[PDB]
Amino acid sequence: MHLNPAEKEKLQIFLASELALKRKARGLKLNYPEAVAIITSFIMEGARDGKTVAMLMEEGKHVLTRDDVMEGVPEMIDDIQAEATFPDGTKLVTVHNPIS
């Protein structure tokens, strides 16, 4: 596979997102790291899908809403950042105030 350090680390994010998605599916209000993981993995998968940075900045604000998460979680998350390989190489995505 020739995994580099970032590729190894970022597998964890996908895994944490999978965990959080299962928790959501069984009806739990998500907590801070769960919410962050879901949105982060969404960004990384979107890059893999070939979306633009601008598309992901928009979409990232609609992945989870305040009724999906515990009290105070929306206000704990000021922004979520992820770097991923787009068709045009690595780029940084910042999603500002992802959960209203």
Partner 1 sequence: MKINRQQYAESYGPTVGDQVRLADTDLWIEVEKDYTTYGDEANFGGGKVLREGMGENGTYTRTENVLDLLLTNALILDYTGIYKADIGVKDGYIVGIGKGGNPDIMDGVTPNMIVGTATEVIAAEGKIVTAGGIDTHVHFINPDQVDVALANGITTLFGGGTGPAEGSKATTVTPGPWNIEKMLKSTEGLPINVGILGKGHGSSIAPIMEQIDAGAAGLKIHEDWGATPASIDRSLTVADEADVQVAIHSDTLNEAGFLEDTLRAINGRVIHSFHVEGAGGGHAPDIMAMAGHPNVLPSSTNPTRPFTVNTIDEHLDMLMVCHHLKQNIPEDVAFADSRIRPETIAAEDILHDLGIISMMSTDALAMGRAGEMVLRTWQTADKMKKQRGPLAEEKNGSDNFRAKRYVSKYTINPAIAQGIAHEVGSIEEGKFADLVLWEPKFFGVKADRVIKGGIIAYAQIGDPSASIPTPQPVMGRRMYGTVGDLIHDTNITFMSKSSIQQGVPAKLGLKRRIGTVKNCRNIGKKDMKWNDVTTDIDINPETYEVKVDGEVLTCEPVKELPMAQRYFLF
Partner 2 sequence: NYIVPGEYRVAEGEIEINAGREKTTIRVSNTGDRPIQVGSHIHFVEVNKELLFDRAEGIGRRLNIPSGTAARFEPGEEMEVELTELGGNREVFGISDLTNGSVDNKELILQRAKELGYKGVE
Return the SS3 of 94.
Answer: strand
In single-letter form, the type of residue at position 95 comes to: V
> What's the Cα-to-Cα distance from 7 to each of 10, 37, 73, 76, rounded to whole Å?
5, 16, 28, 27
Nearest approach in angstroms of CB 66 to partner 2 is: 11
14-53 residues in contact with partner 1 (CB under 8 A) are 16, 19, 31-34, 36-37, 40, 44, 47-48, 52-53
Give the whole-angstrom CA distance, residue 65 versus residue 73.
10
Q: Is 88 in the site for a second copy (CB under 8 A)?
A: no
The contact set with a second copy (CB under 8 A) reads 1-3, 7-8, 11-16, 18-19, 23, 26, 28, 32-33, 36-37, 40, 45, 48-49
